[PDB]
């Protein structure tokens, strides 16, 4: 499945992953493609933060959906 | 009290300085965040959050766009 991750600035990126792929690996894919650290990368879907212990199927994420990519608010 | 900006945008039934269009996941309906030139990014975010009834997680998401706007990352600074 492919999701449309919309960056804070408004730039939408397309990520191709599997439903069985955990959010952590999904983050790693973006970490290698775009080069965004998984710890600073905040993915919010429907007002909920995508936990690494879940999958796309767990959140019942439909295909061609719009996701939001936010950056960390605090460092520590 | 000098936030009488010339460019006022009207959303639904109210005029504000900046009305950012924020999607939730689908195309419709779309949400409009009414930000004022003399308002704090976290305040406006919270104000909108309790207004349209959103989850606290949305706070950082919507506030970041406001923060980055004044921060000028995608503009070229210009804060001082």
Swiss-Prot record, chain A:
Outcome after substituting residue 48 to R: No effect on HLTF-mediated polyubiquitination of PCNA
Coiled-coil segments: none
UniProt effect for mutating residue 76 to A: Loss of ADP-ribosylation
Record PTM ADP-ribosylglycine, positions in chain: 76
PTM entry text: Phosphorylated at Ser-65 by PINK1 during mitophagy. Phosphorylated ubiquitin specifically binds and activates parkin (PRKN), triggering mitophagy. Phosphorylation does not affect E1-mediated E2 charging of ubiquitin but affects discharging of E2 enzymes to form polyubiquitin chains. It also affects deubiquitination by deubiquitinase enzymes such as USP30. Mono-ADP-ribosylated at the C-terminus by PARP9, a component of the PPAR9-DTX3L complex. ADP-ribosylation requires processing by E1 and E2 enzymes and prevents ubiquitin conjugation to substrates such as histones.
UniProt site (Essential for function): 68
Cross-link (Glycyl lysine isopeptide (Gly-Lys) (interchain with K-? in acceptor proteins)): 76
Effect of mutating residue 72 to K: No effect on ADP-ribosylation
Record-listed cross-link Glycyl lysine isopeptide (Lys-Gly) (interchain with G-Cter in ubiquitin), residues: 6, 11, 27, 29, 33, 48, 63
Superkingdom, natural source: Eukaryota
Resulting phenotype, residue 74 to K: No effect on ADP-ribosylation
Domain Ubiquitin-like residue range list: 1-76
(Microbial infection) ADP-ribosylthreonine modifications at: 66
Transmembrane segments annotated in the record for this chain: none
Modified-residue entries (Phosphoserine), positions: 65
Site (Interacts with activating enzyme): 54, 72
Subcellular localization: Cytoplasm; Nucleus
Function: Exists either covalently attached to another protein, or free (unanchored). When covalently bound, it is conjugated to target proteins via an isopeptide bond either as a monomer (monoubiquitin), a polymer linked via different Lys residues of the ubiquitin (polyubiquitin chains) or a linear polymer linked via the initiator Met of the ubiquitin (linear polyubiquitin chains).
Protein name: Ubiquitin
Organism: Homo sapiens (Human)
GN (gene name): UBA52
Portion of the parent chain present: 1 to 76 of 128
Curated annotation (Swiss-Prot), chain B:
Source organism superkingdom: Eukaryota
Span of domain PFU: 1-80
Triggers of expression: Up-regulated by tumor necrosis factor alpha (TNF-alpha) (at protein level).
Subcellular location: Nucleus; Cytoplasm; Synapse
Transmembrane regions listed in the UniProt entry: none
UniProt domain comment: The PUL domain is composed of 6 armadillo-like repeats and mediates the interaction with VCP C-terminus.
Description of how the protein assembles with itself and partners: Interacts with ubiquitin. Interacts with UBXN6, VCP and YOD1; may form a complex involved in macroautophagy.
Role summary: Plays a role in protein ubiquitination, sorting and degradation through its association with VCP. Involved in ubiquitin-mediated membrane proteins trafficking to late endosomes in an ESCRT-dependent manner, and hence plays a role in synaptic vesicle recycling. May play a role in macroautophagy, regulating for instance the clearance of damaged lysosomes. Plays a role in cerebellar Purkinje cell development.
Homology family: Belongs to the WD repeat PLAP family.
Disease: Neurodevelopmental disorder with progressive microcephaly, spasticity, and brain anomalies: An autosomal recessive neurodevelopmental disorder characterized by progressive microcephaly, spastic quadriparesis, global developmental delay, profound intellectual disability and severely impaired or absent motor function. More variable features include seizures and optic atrophy.
Protein name as it appears in the record: Phospholipase A-2-activating protein
Lineage: Eukaryota, Metazoa, Chordata, Craniata, Vertebrata
Range of the intact protein held here: 386 to 465 of 795
